[PDB]
Design an enzyme around this catalytic site. Structure first.
Site, short mmCIF file in Angstrom:
data_model
loop_
_atom_site.label_atom_id
_atom_site.label_comp_id
_atom_site.label_asym_id
_atom_site.label_seq_id
_atom_site.Cartn_x
_atom_site.Cartn_y
_atom_site.Cartn_z
NE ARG A 1 -17.86 -8.12 3.43
CZ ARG A 1 -19.14 -8.53 3.50
NH1 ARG A 1 -19.50 -9.71 2.97
NH2 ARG A 1 -20.05 -7.76 4.11
CG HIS B 1 -10.24 3.39 0.23
ND1 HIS B 1 -10.78 2.13 0.05
CD2 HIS B 1 -9.20 3.23 1.09
CE1 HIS B 1 -10.11 1.26 0.79
NE2 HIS B 1 -9.15 1.90 1.43
CE1 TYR C 1 11.07 14.85 0.96
CE2 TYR C 1 11.27 12.88 2.31
CZ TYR C 1 11.37 14.25 2.17
OH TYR C 1 11.76 15.04 3.25
#
Ligand SMILES: [K+]
Ligand SMILES: [K+]
Lengths: 457, 458
Positions: free
Chosen positions: A1, A47, A91
């Site tokens: 949340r 995710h 990088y």
């Protein structure tokens, strides 16, 4: 949340990033791997929100000025205190830090529950074993529109001693506890101003405190004075503050500043403010304290996720929920160890049945065309498992030396005392509590540094 | 060290280092291309500290189809063309070994070539490749060192191999006997060599001049108009700058009768068209052209290489011989190594056969022993075994005692006695070694051979 779990102290994103990094072998010992890898892995599997969020999340755990104990070992430019942002993920290089290795400890040993990821293809943890108390140590700085936590960092040694304290005394009182955890400790040290705001926050959950920069006043043999700032309030942009002060002196709101020069470097911070041989350094220092962000307010709000529900909590409550978590983690892990141990004891009984009828076992194997035939043979003639049989077959001949047979009986008996001891540790809570004390103390003695913020009374 | 090729493998030091480095890093013919920067970096840090310029341009030359007869480096990106455009920067190219250089490196693992220290005594580089095909004659060599300059021109792989075998069989073969096999050079840019005589002097002496010529032929329009068309140019000559030179030659009016000049070279190959007015004979103009431009040029042959680290000028047959000696050395060292290995593994098996043979006694000796040390000296004294064998017996898992496993041991040992036999024989009989070299070289010819591109006109 956006809000962290109370047990491990991680937002969704951080828990996922860590889990992936540890899946992909990007641990403390192993060498670095390109960020782009850990990021894309996380985006695809756990995710799905974009290089933006995920990378910046990862990066934030790498920053020594944002984390009290950085979870992500970063190599390359992961941005700075002056506000410049990190270099592109193509990088940079990343891995787990030595300390987060503790956050992941025992995850193999069946201590946490796994759930399906977004598309039902893979699995992720719902909580890490979290063997040192991450939420209170490192913090939570996430501010969202409905509920916005803001839990400041703390010296690791302190929190550990406080969790131990609550272990030995379940009815400790907030102030008794505060003699152990005297207050926050920012990754960028400062001076916290009042004991009062801290006490209000730990007793109530919410409350405000005054953080303040460390500035001394060097004085030349001719009595000219310089102000020198070496630390700043947690999360102030050094560059913007310098531009700020420069701005006030240009507007003529502060009078007595000659030059303001940043001399910070590899050896540490060093903002240097020059003062006319006339004016009172001190005063000027206080008007800076009041006008700029050399001294600022920090609003504590102890809000987190208790069993899938946003809850505000007191210091003692956070400690306690963490300790309950460690109790599950340790009980379960010892379930695992019991299983392991019993199994190896099984194999050992086998090798003993063998060592005790060695001649017959030998004659039987050498009169066996196949390994398979030999196995079914051993099984039927000695009442053994396939497990045990194949264990016999895999035995190198030098395991038949006197001292090696002694080392077998040694190990087996030792493993008997362990199965029994583990069984007990399951059965008695005080033993589990002991395990937590011993392990937390190891972690303290391995990862503990001095306290950075001096709390002024 | 010296910018000259070694007679055996035909590489300047720099080339030998690029190849060694590449093979060492796994940039082989199968495995995917790697960034040029990586290979050049490894070479400069480790073996040849003389700038990414020299090292990467060296690496570039070995990848061009138009410089190397049989390209040693498989490149990817812009490695240039015969128009004079240079390769693009090493951040922009990828590379690997070519299928043919896998042969240059064959058997290097098997103690066939000696190593030496690198420029800072931190690494080890080979002194010479195994070079399982004759690279010095096939790809050529060029360049200056310690004053002298070497200029060996490329050759047809088929021809050079056929000759090496020719010298193998008949060690007294003579240069014109030898020549019926190797006609002459064979440049990557196809075209004409004019004199059989030039070639002959060159191979017989070490130095000689040869005359190369563009392949130009005179076409005829239905209008009775003439046009010469050049489809091939001489080695190392610049197409661009020759179009240029001819433009100026006709523009200054040094040669006249020329009407138009178009470069129709494309994917299909080279098609340089030059137009002639009906007033002039395209033949005479062609001859003026051969004379005045680089449609016909002089190639200065000088077979100079490094024999035991000393510049020597060798005659064709000495080149073939020196290569053959190298390969003979190589097969001898290799099969010596294979034998070392074999004899070793067979030693251990002899150990295990001894143990299985008196199994009981060995078992009881072990179990009446207190330490593995005690058991080891036990078996050693009792059965006349080495520490190696004893240990190997102690390391024997129990399932090795099943019938099928004892049978597997006997089989491997058998196979191995047969192999030490064959190996010891190859060693003692040079005709066997020569045989190997013929077989292997003919397999290579069978797999890499192509058609001669340069026609020797008489
Ligand atoms: K202020
Ligand atoms: K000419």
């Amino acid at each position: 949340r956006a809000l962290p779990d109370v047990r491990d102290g991680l937002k969704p994103v951080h828990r996922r990033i860590l889990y992936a990094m540890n899946d992909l072998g990007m641990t403390s010992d192993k060498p670095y791997k390109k960020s782009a890898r850990i990021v894309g892995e996380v985006i695809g599997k756990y995710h799905p929100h974009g290089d933006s969020a995920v990378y910046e999340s990862m990066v934030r755990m790498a920053q020594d000025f944002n984390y009290r104990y950085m979870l992500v070992d970063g190599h390359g430019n992961f941005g700075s205190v002056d506000g410049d942002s990190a270099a592109a993920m193509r990088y940079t290089e990343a891995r787990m830090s030595k300390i987060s290795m503790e956050i992941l400890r025992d995850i193999t040993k069946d201590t946490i529950d796994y759930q399906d990821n977004y598309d039902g293809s893979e699995r992720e943890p719902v909580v890490m074993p979290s063997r040192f108390p991450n939420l209170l140590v490192n913090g939570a700085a996430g501010i969202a529109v409905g509920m916005a936590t803001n839990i400041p960092p703390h010296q690791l040694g302190e929190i550990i001693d406080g969790v131990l304290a609550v272990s030995e005394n379940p009815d400790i009182t907030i102030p008794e506890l505060m003699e152990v955890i005297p207050g926050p400790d920012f990754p960028t040290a400062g001076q916290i101003l009042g004991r009062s705001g801290i006490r209000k926050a730990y007793e109530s959950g919410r409350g405000s405190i005054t953080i303040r920069a460390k500035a001394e006043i060097e004085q030349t043999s001719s009595g000219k004075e310089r102000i020198i700032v070496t630390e700043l309030p947690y999360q102030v942009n050094k560059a913007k503050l310098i531009e700020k002060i420069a701005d006030l002196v240009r507007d003529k709101k502060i009078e007595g500043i000659t030059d303001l020069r940043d001399e910070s470097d590899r050896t540490g911070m060093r903002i240097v403010i020059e003062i006319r041989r006339d004016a009172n350094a001190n005063v000027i220092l206080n008007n800076l304290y009041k006008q700029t962000a050399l001294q600022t307010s920090f609003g504590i709000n102890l809000l987190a996720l208790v069993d899938g529900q946003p809850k505000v909590l007191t210091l003692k409550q956070c400690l306690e929920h963490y300790l309950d978590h460690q109790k599950v983690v340790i009980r379960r892990r010892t379930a695992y160890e019991l299983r392991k141990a019993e199994a190896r004891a099984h194999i050992l009984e086998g090798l003993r049945v063998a060592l005790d009828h060695l001649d017959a076992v030998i004659s039987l194997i050498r009169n066996s065309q196949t390994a398979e035939i030999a196995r079914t043979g051993l099984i039927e003639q000695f009442s053994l498992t396939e497990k045990q049989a194949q264990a016999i077959l895999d035995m190198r001949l030098q395991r038949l030396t006197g001292l090696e047979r002694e080392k077998i009986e040694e190990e087996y008996q030792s493993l008997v005392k362990l199965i029994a001891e583990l069984k007990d540790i399951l059965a008695n809570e005080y033993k589990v509590l002991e395990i937590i004390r011993e392990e937390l103390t190891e972690i303290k003695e391995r990862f503990n540094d001095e306290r950075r913020t001096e709390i002024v009374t």
